[PDB]
């Protein structure tokens, strides 16, 4: 069953979480949804932290989970609602044998090094190509206005 | 379509119209044979009502063909069904293309087969005696099949070809290179450039290393311009079938192994012995008569062995036990065997008529003798099998009156009243499953009959559209058997209805038969059957394929569903790559479906109610959605309501979606400016988009334009004339309606860079007032998708859109076979494979009802009728897992009582540890976790003194409803593997 | 026996065509399943393959079914229609 494997992965991950994950908790009423705090390790994103939410479909691992940021961000690679078109969770590249730890590592290296894979919003790509500094200002303002402080 | 044109006008003869002949005739009528001619002089008796569904008790002592024709003509009113009253004649065969002799005598079989062989008329000799069924085919000395295999022609995308004498070309990456084999016949049905090679004569192809396809001389042709599509052409194969009298002495049997070939040769010898016994003594052997069986086996003994394959040495002496067993039960005719053999025979008739698929290599011998009582149990007796006027006289002769009563005292559950469901219901009605007060039958289905369903359904009529499918199926079953007590239900069998189908309901049934259209539903029903320990009969068809399996608890392996396919049945799509660069027909069809869903279905409710009080362009992606949706027709100061087939409006959708949008994409992302990772490394990776201009010589563009106009008129509720008429001349006469309106129809009205609010403050006010004006209009209902109403013009529009966008993005065009996979215009199951799987399920029912049987008695089945593939193999033993002291299978469960006071979670853990010797680390109830060994000590010590029912009430918030006599929850234990699964915990509340 | 030299066998696709494979008798059936899955583009759980009319178990080795060089193996895909 998907629920048992999700629980086992969550327990194994919490027994030794990566440094970029804090207060990773799940609701015992619905264990197929998680809340976690991501710590980017590359400036200027490393200034604050983001709470990300990942939802597991009932047919896990035969269907990639969806990851949505609770806090709004201004990124070309992140959807407006918070969804991420991650290469690993793509249906054309998804593999049930993979583990959520690998997905978390991929997301961490993606947020520590933003990459222009697909312009989810064309205006975002146009503004990033024409004036990256305004995009940097918008991203830092979004982090400062919606993000949470970095704990220890 | 051309294949069924031959079937539409063909004429076929069916003789010996018994149960088997009735099945062949029904299948032929369902498939649409143009003219079906029946022939049966004998009157109906009791001994053939057990297998023929067209004859009731009121048809006794009446001619079988005359009685059957009344219902046969009613099955499909477009099929002309006539009855030949007299005797067969040589000049009558001239007007028939195929003849079928079902259960005819050997001498008549030889005579008619020789007469048809002389005149070149396909001949079939299907015959069912007992639990074994013989089939014979003879399509003539020179028969040519135009489709040797059941497969659409291969299609590949060539990326570059060479104008050289060897003619070595290149093609895009794909499995077609491993599919295209040397010596194949291919045709270049479509190519940009090479006008000589476009639609050229068929030519061979040769393959070498690195996929080097060698075509031949092409130097004199024009220079290479662009890539195209290469199509495979199958080479017709000639087949030589010997005459019946000659083939009887040299039986060429279709089988899958040498042992099966020997078994089928023994069955052929037994059939010949039965025929000779009938000729010599004038009567078939009596039901389970010992002396008749001894006479038959002795006749087979003096039947010299070299009568089969004289050139082949005798592999082994004939098994006397097999011939005796066939002779004993040969006196009766069974509904499952009749269904299976008639299905195969009708498929062979379709092969002969339409020349499609490889014909059967003369002989076939279906065996089902495992349905008899075990070798250590008691055998049926002539006293038990004596005729007594029951409609199941033949089945009783095969099995006995006690087995018939056992079938009567049975309650079963049928899930899904589809084609397989209808055929299963017919088999149950004929067999007598629950045909009494002590038994019954249940039918479960959710859908309602539609126009596209009943066209090939057996139990449905033209007036049944809109009625519940289960109710109509139950009425038809009661008509087939008055003694049957069928209770239709409209509640589906899914997780959202466990209370309706709880333990109370499933305690009534003795078994479940599943005929479902999805893997998810099959998995759920198998899970329910495992939970309640009820035998499951599962079947499925696709094209000419067919599977039929039985799952007996603690005997056979549980139903291992293909979880990948279950997930892929209904899954979200990462349209990011699809929106950026499509690569498959699935990508473009999903794009079209999503575009329809958002623009027409979702937009109606979102833009009217949601936007009035919730989020808007300030935090949504509407800045581009509005620009995509508004200028499709124009500004017009109001949404128009005029006639929609004008030139300007019809061409606008094609220009914006495929011409102007692609032009804007190309200007924004040129093929040399594709920023894959920041600055181009290989710009335009493996593909290059190309805008297309509306050329009047291309029929597909004009077809798409007219289909879009018709679709818009249909959805807007406005009349539309037949623009395919002389109005096409006006359309072609003026291909440029307004050349000067280029600027307004490209992007907004004056914007090229947007910048920092260059449009002005009044622009947003104008947009808001335009949106408010556009809000008032027709009440566009978010109506449900029309799955069977192909006349709405949606299907043509979406197919044209996909086939044009794929070609625009460099993808080869999608064929009709690939598009038929989608739910829209999904291909109905062929009647032959449906009847075959239903007969196999009935054969397995004969053993499930028979009580305790070993695994070596049950037999899963898989069939492919196009290539004459059929296998009956015993299923695997249950997967025995082990963990320390514990050892279990897939059917095992951990039942633990709660006690008079509900044992607390700590008490439950202690009980598990003391009883089964294992300590649980993780324990959860479905989706909510209850206990975890890794939890903090204070939280664990808080949870331990709580009773399990109290804990689940606290967490889930739902008290145990009535009927929840047991509670199911998952548990894991320390030292276990990540992949292994422990038995579910049944907590007896 | 060590049967070090691999042998060539034919696996029949559902759509008429067939392809050749080079396998060992010590090689597991699941390895052949994943090979034909990669070549045919269909997940190995969606289908199963059979030899001489009887199915092949994933855990069992190829040698137990008595495969011979240039043998034919048909892949049976599980069916949904009903
Ligand atoms: O398409 P089809 O004729 O092959 O399907 C047979 C019937 O099965 C119904 N169906 C599908 N799924 C279920 C469940 N889970 N329970 C009951 N009936 C079900 C379809 O309505 C179809 O008619």
Residue numbers in the entry:
A (entry chain C): 2 to 153
B (entry chain A): 24 to 1012
C (entry chain B): 76 to 157
Passage from the reporting paper:
ISG15 is a ubiquitin-like protein that is activated by an E1 enzyme (Uba7) and transferred to a cognate E2 enzyme (UBE2L6) to form a UBE2L6-ISG15 intermediate that functions with E3 ligases that catalyze conjugation of ISG15 to target proteins. E1 occupies the apex of the Ub/Ubl conjugation cascade where it performs two main functions: (1) specific activation of Ub/Ubl in a two-step process that results in the formation of a thioester bond between Ub/Ubl and an E1 catalytic cysteine (adenylation and thioester bond formation) and (2) recruitment of cognate E2 enzymes followed by transfer of Ub/Ubl to an E2 catalytic cysteine (thioester transfer). While Uba1 (E1) is specific to Ub activation, ISG15 is exclusively activated by Uba7 (E1) and specifically transferred to the E2 enzyme UBE2L6. Here, we present cryo-EM structures of human Uba7 in complex with UBE2L6, ISG15 adenylate, and ISG15 thioester intermediate in a conformational state that is poised for catalysis of Uba7-UBE2L6-ISG15 thioester transfer.
Previous studies in the Ub system have shown that although the single-loaded E1-E2-Ub(t) complex is capable of catalyzing thioester transfer, that double-loaded E1 is significantly more efficient at E2 recruitment and catalysis. Although modestly ordered, the ISG15(t) projects away from the surface of UBE2L6 towards the ‘back’ of the complex where it sits atop the AAD, sandwiched between the UFD and SCCH domain. This result was somewhat unexpected based on a previous structure of Uba1/CDC34-Ub(t) in which two distinct ‘open’ and ‘closed’ conformations of Ub(t) were observed that both reside on the front side of the complex. To validate that the density on the backside of the Uba7-UBE2L6-ISG15(t)/ISG15(a) complex indeed belongs to ISG15(t), we solved the cryo-EM structure single-loaded Uba7-UBE2L6/ISG15(a) complex lacking ISG15(t), with a nominal resolution of 3.24 Å (masked at 0.143 FSC). Analysis of the cryo-EM density reveals no density in the back of the complex that corresponds to the density present in the double-loaded Uba7-UBE2L6-ISG15(t)/ISG15(a) complex structure we ascribe to the ISG15(t) CTD. With respect to the ISG15(a) NTD/UFD interaction, these contacts may serve as a sensor for the presence of ISG15(a) in double-loaded Uba7/UBE2L6/ISG15 complex and provide an additional mechanism as to why double-loaded complex is more efficient at thioester transfer compared to the single-loaded counterpart.
